[PDB]
Amino acid sequence: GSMRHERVVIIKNMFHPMDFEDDPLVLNEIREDLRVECSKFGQIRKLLLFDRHPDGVASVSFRDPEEADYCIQTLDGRWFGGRQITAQAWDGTTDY
Numbered sequence: 846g847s848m849r850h851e852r853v854v855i856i857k858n859m860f861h862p863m864d865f866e867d868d869p870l871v872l873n874e875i876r877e878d879l880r881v882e883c884s885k886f887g888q889i890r891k892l893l894l895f896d897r898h899p900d901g902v903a904s905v906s907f908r909d910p911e912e913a914d915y916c917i918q919t920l921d922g923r924w925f926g927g928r929q930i931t932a933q934a935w936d937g938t939t940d941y
């Protein structure tokens with residue numbers, strides 16, 4: 846087994862907060878789309894979007910550390926909604 850953070854992926858550049866200015870529903874569109882996409886890598890335990898964060902941060906927690914690893918390897922550098930995203934392992938201590 847593993848400490849919790851080994852199951853957690855930090856995804857950046859999913860959005861910019863300006864995206865939700867005119868239409869709050871856009872935030873939920875990106876949440877849903879990220880749920881659908883991250884379901885490819887493993888069983889999602891938690892998914893959060895830090896909707897005010899300039900860097901477009903989301904956290905995704907999986908059931909198993911191997912799922913997080915597969916997500917990081919596959920999503921990093923992909924394009925979503927015109928944005929080139931990154932995916933990194935969480936460190937267990939950085940808050941967004």
Ligand SMILES: [Cl-]
Pocket residue numbers: 861
């Ligand atoms: Cl931007």
Ligand SMILES: [Cl-]
Pocket residue numbers: 885
């Ligand atoms: Cl795919």
Ligand SMILES: [Cl-]
Pocket residue numbers: 880891892893
């Ligand atoms: Cl969620």
Ligand SMILES: [Cl-]
Pocket residue numbers: 876892893894895
């Ligand atoms: Cl959220």
Ligand SMILES: [Mg+2]
Pocket residue numbers: 851910913914934
């Ligand atoms: Mg890992």
